[PDB]
């Protein structure tokens, strides 16, 4: 009867499929805090980051994988962690389960066995057990059907400049001589190497009822007290594929600025003749990659990154058996409630980060162009009263609108408690048809630890760039 009750409870939730699944957040955030009027007053904030191919991690990734190693038989609560590729695996002892491992070719009887329900004992013990068996009995013969996938995208370009100028002045009195010589040389190099391959593929046996989720003696009331309401559902890991992933990225820049001026003179009286030169060399070399696959011999070469990396890795480790061990790549979990809601996550999860600042956090304004813009820094400021109502006292900056031709640098540090900040940095283009232009504009900006707003360019193409960091 308990099992039936558990099933009825699971059936009862009628959570919307689109809204519930689409439960994500934004970029940065901020949360204030005020209580009482006799102690102190502080404020904090919260920001979020994302990874993909730019700023990735390997150790971190590995750690994440270990945390969510529910290849078969899982139950992640659909709330926030799931969407962020990192939820909880809270699940009471359940019934036995079976996992199939389709490959190049195997037996039927041995193909499917019997697995229990643990964290990293049966799933890792059973899978590994069978995995070794295949490599043991089956020496070679059949070839593992591994789907290869790798794309290469490089981008290298250089730029040169040779400006020569030579003129001399001579009148019926004084004689002069000018000499200008400068050369420009700037070339950049960009190349992105990618590589992916999946061989191992684990799958689970769809669930019919709560027989796999809960055992004989289950508690529908004790399990609901933990964290199983209507807002969040129980998500269980579906299938899983193994394999590796070859990564490679490197970029090298170069620039040269040689200045050589030659001045000559010979006027009736004094003889001045001087000549100065100039030199400047800038180099930038950076390389980084990651091999999720997990190789050895053909691993060092790839890591270094030369010419025989991809090939050396895609020619020595073809036959997937034991030579090259696999590694968790993709991840797929299913919702154990109505055999419908299925989530499709990746392998790289986002890393949360939250800090606090007592009286830190100031706004900087770096202007380096050939245009006159009027900064409109204006923000409000709350405050507690004797009764218990939060008042408001807007206080605009001292320089609320005015022309400021380059160079121009400043910064409006914060000030304890605050809220809202209207800034209007409209650059003056002048022209003839218009008069005022609005480049950058943001409403109710988030109190960032260290935000910077600089605009590089001329009076035609505003190349503004806002910098917001929170170390």
UniProtKB/Swiss-Prot annotation:
Keywords of the record: Cytolysis, Hemolysis, Host cell membrane, Host membrane, Lipid-binding, Membrane, Secreted, Toxin, Transmembrane, Transmembrane beta strand, Virulence
GO MF, one example: cholesterol binding
Effect recorded for residue 428 to A: Wild-type hemolytic activity
GO biological process, one term: killing of cells of another organism
PROSITE patterns: THIOL_CYTOLYSINS (PS00481)
Motif (Cholesterol binding): 459-460
GO cellular component, one term: extracellular region
Effect of residue 226 to A: 6% hemolytic activity
Topology in the lipid bilayer: Multi-pass membrane protein
Effect of substituting residue 205 to R: Loss of hemolytic activity
Outcome reported for the amino acid change (mutating residue 304 to R): 320-fold decrease in hemolytic activity
Main localisation: secreted
Family: Belongs to the cholesterol-dependent cytolysin family.
Role this protein plays: A cholesterol-dependent toxin that causes cytolysis by forming pores in cholesterol-containing host membranes. After binding to target membranes, the protein undergoes a major conformation change, leading to its insertion in the host membrane and formation of an oligomeric pore complex. Cholesterol is required for binding to host membranes, membrane insertion and pore formation; cholesterol binding is mediated by a Thr-Leu pair in the C-terminus. Can be reversibly inactivated by oxidation.
Protein name per the record: Pneumolysin
Protein species of origin: Streptococcus pneumoniae serotype 2 (strain D39 / NCTC 7466)
């Amino acid at each position: 009867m308990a099992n039936k009750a558990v099933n009825d409870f699971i059936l009862a939730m009628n959570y919307d499929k689109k809204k519930l699944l689409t439960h994500q957040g934004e970029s940065i955030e901020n949360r204030f805090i005020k209580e009482g009027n006799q102690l102190p007053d502080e404020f904090v904030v919260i920001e979020r980051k994302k990874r993909s191919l730019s700023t990735n991690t390997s150790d971190i990734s590995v750690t994440a994988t270990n945390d969510s190693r529910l290849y078969p038989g899982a139950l992640l609560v659909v709330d926030e962690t799931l969407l962020e590729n990192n939820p909880t695996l809270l699940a009471v002892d359940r019934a036995p389960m079976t996992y199939s491992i389709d490959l190049p070719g195997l037996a039927s009887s041995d193909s499917f066995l019997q697995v229990e329900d643990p964290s990293n004992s049966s799933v890792r013990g059973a899978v590994n057990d069978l995995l070794a068996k295949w490599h043991q009995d089956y020496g070679q013969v059949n070839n593992v059907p591994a789907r290869m996938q790798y794309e290469k995208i490089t981008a290298h370009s250089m730029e040169q400049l040779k400006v020569k100028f030579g003129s001399d002045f001579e009148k019926a009195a004084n004689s002069l001589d000018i000499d200008f010589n400068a050369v420009h040389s700037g070339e950049k190099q960009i190349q992105i190497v990618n590589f992916k391959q999946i061989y191992y593929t684990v799958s689970v046996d769809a669930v019919k009822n709560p027989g796999d989720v809960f055992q004989d003696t289950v508690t529908v009331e004790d399990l609901k007290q933990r964290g199983i309401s209507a807002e969040r559902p129980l998500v269980y890991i579906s299938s899983v594929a193994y394999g590796r992933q070859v990564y490679l990225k490197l970029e090298t820049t170069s620039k040269s600025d040689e200045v050589q001026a030659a001045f000559e003179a010979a006027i009736l009286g004094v003889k001045v003749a001087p000549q100065t030169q100039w030199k400047q060399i800038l180099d930038n070399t950076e390389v980084k990659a990651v091999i999720l696959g997990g190789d050895p011999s053909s691993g060092a070469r790839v890591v270094t990154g030369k010419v025989d990396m991809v090939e050396d890795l895609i020619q020595e480790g073809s036959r997937f058996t034991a030579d090259h061990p696999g590694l968790p790549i993709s991840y797929t979990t299913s919702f154990l409630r109505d055999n419908v809601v299925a989530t499709f996550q990746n392998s790289t999860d986002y890393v949360e980060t939250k800090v606090t600042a007592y009286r830190n956090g100031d706004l900087l304004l770096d202007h380096s162009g050939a245009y006159v813009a009027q900064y409109y820094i204006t923000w409000d400021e709350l405050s507690y009263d004797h009764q218990g109502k939060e008042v408001l006292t807007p206080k605009a900056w001292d320089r609320n609108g005015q022309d400021l031709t380059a160079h121009f640098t400043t910064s409006i540090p914060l000030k304890g408690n605050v809220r809202n900040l209207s800034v209007k940095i409209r650059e003056c283009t002048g022209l003839a048809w218009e008069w005022w232009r609005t480049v950058y504009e943001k409403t109710d900006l988030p109190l960032v630890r260290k935000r910077t707003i600089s605009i590089w360019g001329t009076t035609l193409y505003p190349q503004v760039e806002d910098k917001v960091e929170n170390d």
